[PDB]
Amino acid sequence: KDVLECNVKTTEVVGDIILKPANNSLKITEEVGHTDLMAAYVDNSSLTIKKPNELSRVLGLKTLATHGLAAVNSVPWDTIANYAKPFL
Numbered sequence: 001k002d003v004l005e006c007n008v009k010t011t012e013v014v015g016d017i018i019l020k021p022a023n024n025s026l027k028i029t030e031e032v033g034h035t036d037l038m039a040a041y042v043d044n045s046s047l048t049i050k051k052p053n054e055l056s057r058v059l060g061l062k063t064l065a066t067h068g069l070a071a072v073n074s075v076p077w078d079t080i081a082n083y084a085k086p087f088l
Contacts, residue, residue, distance in 0.1 A: 041084040046073040
């Protein structure tokens with residue numbers, strides 16, 4: 001199984017990969033929401049969503065549960081920017 005060093009608190013199996021606890025590592029979004037997308041737009045950052053919901057699917061986003069290590073900071077900037085502008 002593939003391994004991801006991230007900010008999880010317990011060792012967890014998500015899909016076909018494993019999240020291992022590492023302090024001050026990669027931030028993990030459990031399920032994407034409005035605040036997560038608003039913060040990624042402001043922080044000049046991407047997102048690593050761990051489990052999918054309706055919003056992540058309709059935005060065509062990759063999650064750790066469905067895409068493994070490929071979801072690491074995989075949320076494109078055009079998606080974050082286009083979602084967040086009706087709210088500014």
